[PDB]
Design a protein around this ligand. Structure first.
Ligand SMILES: Nc1nc2c(ncn2[C@@H]2O[C@H](COP(=O)(O)OP(=O)(O)O)[C@@H](O)[C@H]2O)c(=O)[nH]1
Ligand SMILES: Nc1nc2c(ncn2[C@@H]2O[C@H](COP(=O)(O)OP(=O)(O)O)[C@@H](O)[C@H]2O)c(=O)[nH]1
Ligand SMILES: *SCCNC(=O)C1CCN(C(=O)COc2ccc(Cl)cc2Cl)CC1
Ligand SMILES: *SCCNC(=O)C1CCN(C(=O)COc2ccc(Cl)cc2Cl)CC1
Ligand SMILES: [Ca+2]
Ligand SMILES: [Ca+2]
Ligand SMILES: [Ca+2]
Ligand SMILES: [Ca+2]
Lengths: 167, 168
């Protein structure tokens, strides 16, 4: 079977750990240590074909890091996560994508834009704004709630579809 | 001196001809025949360095065209023009950029996003939308009015700056 390395990226507190732990362990973590950076395995069937996912939930400081470059180099697909009630996290998506482009020396890297915390009544990032960003990047956009599990599987499955299309 | 092939692209009626004729001949044309596709030569000085510009003002049908592909292949920089009172023309920018990238093997092609008709108060494309689009594409955004000549020189000069950056 095929194996894929996925990387979950995004600003502090957008829900990267919560999304990943929901996918892997099927519960919502409300206080996950923000310094834990780890990877998780899961075997999944997507569109009838099994794949082994290795998912890195990233955590670090705002700084250049050779180790982070190595994570980007080995990563085959990236979830670009922002929170719908945090405009800064949406604006910074652009910078995170530029870092991936720099390391991988490529603009065609598999990526999915993820707008998390969709269960919250309020939002500061418009859906159209996010759809338009994803359109400009040529990538899918998925709305999620790690809290209710809405769209969690879809976000990761869609990323795998993107990696498969790229290969 | 260096010589660059520039190509002006954009939807029907966004002001490609009006912009180009303003740059070349310094007057505003109201009813320019929409079937005329032609090139103009112009020596310009930009940041103290002279370049010869060969500028193609495009016109054609909404159809695949081998000839248009050849224009894209030889073109070195592209003005992506929309009109600020025409939302469809702004949405269509994306498709025009995709065609240029298809033909040019996904090169990081020099391009400038141009929001024309900025003199009009009938705006439907928000300025922020356009800045955000240009940011995503990694290109400059210039607002222009072929009618008042606002930004016309700047749009073309900025494209030449982008070409010079790329060829370095
Ligand atoms: N309301 C809501 N809160 C969320 C959601 N996902 C994460 N959170 C909260 O946001 C905080 C940060 O989440 P975490 O996964 O640790 O963020 P990380 O820093 O990106 O790894 C946590 O306390 C979560 O409870 C969501 O979908 N909805
Ligand atoms: N108000 C205004 N009208 C413009 C401007 N630029 C072009 N036009 C008008 O828009 C129409 C189409 O312009 P044209 O240059 O022929 O567009 P093209 O089809 O893209 O070559 C004409 O009536 C022009 O006079 C502008 O900056 N302001
Ligand atoms: S919640 C406290 C921890 N803060 C962070 O983890 C932040 C560090 C900066 N940052 C990024 O660099 C996001 O971009 C990437 C991260 C990892 C990888 Cl492999 C690639 C990219 Cl582009 C935001 C989170
Ligand atoms: S105003 C009546 C004439 N209509 C047109 O000229 C339209 C034809 C379709 N179209 C485009 O294809 C714009 O995109 C390009 C045109 C030329 C070149 Cl070399 C490259 C591109 Cl991407 C809009 C104008
Ligand atoms: Ca975390
Ligand atoms: Ca794509
Ligand atoms: Ca014309
Ligand atoms: Ca650029």
């Amino acid at each position: 079977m095929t194996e894929y390395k996925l990387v979950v990226v995004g600003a502090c507190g957008v829900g990267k750990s919560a999304l990943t732990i929901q996918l892997i362990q099927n519960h919502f973590v409300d206080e996950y240590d923000p310094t834990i950076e780890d990877s998780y395995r899961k075997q999944v069937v997507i569109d009838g074909e099994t794949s082994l996912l290795d998912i890195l939930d990233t955590a670090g400081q705002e700084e250049y890091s050779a180790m982070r470059d190595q994570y980007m180099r080995t990563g085959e697909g990236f979830l670009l996560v922002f929170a719908i009630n945090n405009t800064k996290s949406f604006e910074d998506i652009h910078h995170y994508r530029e870092q991936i482009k720099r390391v991988k020396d490529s603009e065609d890297v598999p990526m999915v834009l993820v707008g998390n915390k969709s269960d919250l009544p309020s939002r500061t990032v418009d859906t159209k704004q996010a759809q338009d960003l994803a359109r400009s990047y040529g990538i899918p956009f998925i709305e999620t709630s790690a809290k209710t599990r809405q769209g969690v599987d879809d976000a990761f499955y869609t990323l795998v579809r993107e990696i498969r299309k790229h290969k």
